[PDB]
Amino acid sequence: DVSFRLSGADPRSYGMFIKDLRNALPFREKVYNIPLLLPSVSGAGRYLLMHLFNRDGKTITVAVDVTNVYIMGYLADTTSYFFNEPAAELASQYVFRDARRKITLPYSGDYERLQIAAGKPREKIPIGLPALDSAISTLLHYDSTAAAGALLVLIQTTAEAARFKYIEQQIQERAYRDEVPSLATISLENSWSGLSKQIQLAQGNNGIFRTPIVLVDNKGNRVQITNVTSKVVTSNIQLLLNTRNI
Ligand SMILES: *[C@@H]1O[C@H](CO)[C@@H](O[C@@H]2O[C@H](CO)[C@@H](O[C@@H]3O[C@H](CO)[C@@H](O)[C@H](O)[C@@H]3O[C@@H]3OC[C@@H](O)[C@H](O)[C@H]3O)[C@H](O)[C@H]2NC(C)=O)[C@H](O)[C@H]1NC(C)=O
């Protein structure tokens, strides 16, 4: 399992945890040096357990799906909470089994629904190590709308961080001060599937993408990725979603 403590968590320690998270996700193949995630895994082996501890030591165990690095549910106290979705429901059969009670959050684990439930778009939610510390705390005492928001933060500071080197930096800078994500950051999160598929379809088309993916760079304006030489590919995206799960 991979663990992380916000107590005296400078940009380095975090960087190390994100490395551990990446190294925990198994793969067999590599598409252009970028680890290609397995198309499936059966049983308990399909789940990764993160032990996050807040500045005060309070913890929670989050379950991750190693074929796509999706948050399935978590364990606070003796309770486990799972998103309201099939994969999560399947996950419960293997994780947090000695949990006294299991609760199913009234929402699904995708960004859109999580935003509707919390009442604010990701653009208006400050992320960072302090907010991660808040999120770990908010999750300790049940509150569906408080959790929807704390989950938007938890997902972006771990899952998305591991996926894009860029997003790991955005968080390390906000290690002592939160701030809403950069438009560059959102476009990336909204492209994990697109990029992954295209980087894979390029293998056999001369590193060329069958179709372009637009982004924002960070400068603040439109960008278009046309092939595997681009900065995003060569030095950003760290994990590729197996086209099979698409
Ligand atoms: C493969 O991906 C690369 C990027 O990873 C792309 O190739 C070339 O990228 C430049 C980027 O600007 C495209 O844009 C214009 O290209 C012409 C010809 O090279 C320039 O005269 C234009 O100014 C402009 O690019 C210049 O590059 C220097 C920078 O200061 C500015 O961006 C600009 O001045 C090129 O058109 C593109 N090459 C071709 C043949 O289209 C491209 O996405 C893709 N192409 C291939 C063949 O793999």
The CA 193 to ligand 1 mean position distance, Å, reads 25
- In whole angstroms, what is the distance from residue 143 CA to residue 2 CA? 26
79-82 vs 70-76, strand pairing mode: antiparallel
Instruction: Retrieve residue 226's tokens.
Output: 């046309």
CATH number of the domain at 230, please. Answer: 4.10.470.10
The CA-based angle 194-196-200, given to 5 degrees, is: 115
Nearest CA to ligand 1 atom 5: 230
* Distance (Å) of CA 117 to CA 48, 73, 151: 26, 16, 11
Q: Of 162, 195, 211, which residue sits at a domain end?
A: 162
Q: Are 115 and 212 in a shared domain?
A: no
Sign of CA dihedral 189, 190, 196, 202: negative
Q: Are 116 and 212 in a shared domain?
A: no
| Per-residue three-class SS string for the chain | CEEEECCCCCHHHHHHHHHHHHHHCCEEEEECCEEEECCCCCCHHHEEEEEEECCCCCEEEEEEECCCCEEEEEEECCEEEECCCHHHHHHHCCCCCCCCEEEECCCCCCHHHHHHHHCCCHHHCCECHHHHHHHHHHCCCCCHHHHHHHHHHHHHCCHHHHHEHHHHHHHHHCCCCCECCCHHHHHHHCCHHHHHHHHHHHCCCCCEEEEEEEECCCCCCCEEEEECCCHHHHCCECCECCHHHC
Residues of the domain holding 242: 163-246
- In whole angstroms, what is the distance from residue 59 CA to residue 45 CA? 22
Closest residue by Cα to residue 240 from 164, 174, 173 = 164
Q: Are 75 and 157 in a shared domain?
A: yes
Per the CB < 8 A criterion, the answer to whether 16 and 139 are in contact is: no
Q: Which residues pair with 47 in a beta bridge?
A: 65
The CA 226 to ligand 1 mean position distance, Å, reads 10
Q: Which residues pair with 127 in a beta bridge?
A: 179
Q: Are 113 and 42 in a shared domain?
A: yes
Output b/e per residue, 213-243; b: 16+ Cβ within 10 A: bebbeeeeeebebeebebebbeebbbbbbbb
Q: Of 104, 139, 162, which residue sits at a domain end?
A: 162
CATH number of the domain at 73, please. Answer: 3.40.420.10
The ligand 1 atom nearest the CA atom of 231? 5
* Rg (the chain; Cα; Å): 18
Q: Of 162, 190, 205, which residue sits at a domain end?
A: 162
Resolution of the experimental model, in Å, one decimal: 2.2
The domain total for the chain is: 2
Please count the CA atoms within 13 angstroms of the CA of 129 that sit on its side-chain side: 25
Q: Are 205 and 90 in a shared domain?
A: no
Q: Are 151 and 168 in a shared domain?
A: no
Q: Are 149 and 27 in a shared domain?
A: yes
Count of other CB atoms within 10 angstroms of residue 104: 15
Closest residue by Cα to residue 76 from 143, 21, 155 = 143
Sign of CA dihedral 14, 8, 48, 59: negative
Closest residue by Cα to residue 99 from 61, 130, 135, 43 = 61
Q: Are 58 and 121 in a shared domain?
A: yes
59-65 vs 47-53, strand pairing mode: antiparallel
- In whole angstroms, what is the distance from residue 76 CA to residue 60 CA? 5
Q: Are 112 and 184 in a shared domain?
A: no
Pocket test for ligand 1, best of 210, 215, 226, 235 (most atoms within 8 A of CB): 226
| Active site positions, annotated | 160
Q: Are 102 and 197 in a shared domain?
A: no
Q: Are 190 and 147 in a shared domain?
A: no
- In whole angstroms, what is the distance from residue 73 CA to residue 161 CA? 18
Q: Are 180 and 154 in a shared domain?
A: no
The CA 229 to ligand 1 mean position distance, Å, reads 11
